[PDB]
Amino acid sequence: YHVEASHTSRIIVPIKKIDYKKYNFENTPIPRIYPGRQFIQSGLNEEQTIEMRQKF
Amino acid sequence: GYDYDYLFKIVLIGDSGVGKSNLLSRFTTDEFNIESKSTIGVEFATRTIEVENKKIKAQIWDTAGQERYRAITSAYYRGAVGALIVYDISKSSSYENCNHWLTELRENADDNVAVGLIGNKSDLAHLRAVPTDEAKNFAMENQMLFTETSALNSDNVDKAFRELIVAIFQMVSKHQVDLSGAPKGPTISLTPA
């Protein structure tokens, strides 16, 4: 795709859907990329942390 | 019984519901008029420890004003040579009031008073809502001693309290000297006639 200067170009790239049967994002806490740190609760009930985890 | 050389007044002050009533049971003696927390404003405790070969009596006043004790709690800091600010590391509301309590002490309590900081219920790491780093950083600015205490992690509050007493005694003690062949025989009068 030749994109000239200061001109947006919409790209279409298809994706196969991810299937929940073999990923289990529901219970997979977000990685701590610098572990060995004091644990502090951000504060989020189950219904919100599950949402944020799925989105991430 | 009245052998203690010095009598220091200490106030165990903190937010309501923090758990002071369970806290002092370790480094205090549990007899005499128990309770009376709401009768006037306070409950009383005593401890005896020797520092530099000198007995010291420490009286702990765990005041708590709910809605009625506005001027009385203020009057109860008349001569407190020590204070023992307490907060719980479960809810940041208790920590947020520490500056307010310290302001009340340094405004109303005895001049140049030594004050410490205690973090109670540290065993409950499930709902920890305040880090030790921030606690120490806040302690540094106001030259306060800081530690964390719990039922399982006992015997640390005792050391902290003894260390606070030692800090007080090295600052409100005037140095003294240990003040403890006389003639014998029949004298003769020599005053003039």
Nearest-CA distance from B64 to chain A in Å?
Answer: 29
Tell me if A41 and B133 make a contact (CB, 8 A cut-off). no
Of B91, B81, B76, the residue nearest B165 (C-alpha): B81
Contacts of A41 in chain B (CB under 8 A): 127-129
Q: Tell me whether residue B69 is exposed, middle or buried, using C-beta atoms within 10 angstroms of its C-beta: 0 to 12, 13 to 18, 19 or more.
A: middle
Strand partners, B76: none
With an 8 Å Cβ cutoff, are A41 and B125 in contact? no
Asked whether B148 and B132 are in contact (CB, 8 A), the reply is yes
Q: Does B132 touch chain A (CB under 8 A)?
A: yes
Q: Which amino acid is at A55?
A: K
- Residue where the block lists tokens 């002050």: B13
For residues A53 and A28, the answer to whether their CB atoms sit within 8 Å is: yes
Residue B8: strand, helix, or coil: strand
Q: For testing the chain B interface, which of A37, A39, A40 should be mutated: the one with the most B CBs within 10 Å?
A: A40
In whole angstroms, give the CA distance from residue B144 to residue B108.
17
**Structure obtained using:** cryo-EM
Would you call B133 and A38 a contact, using CB atoms and an 8 Å cutoff? Answer: yes
Euclidean distance between CA atoms B52 and B169, whole angstroms:
9
Separation between Cα atoms, residue B57 and residue B9, nearest integer Å: 9
B5, with CB counted inside 10 A (0-12, 13-18, 19+), is middle
Pairing of β B44-50 and β B55-61: antiparallel
Closest residue in chain A to residue B133, using alpha carbons only: A38
> What letters, b where the CB count within 10 A reaches 16 and e where it falls short, cover A7-18?
eeeeeeeeeeee
- In whole angstroms, give the CA distance from residue B25 to residue B16: 17
Interface A:B, Cβ pairs < 8 A: 13
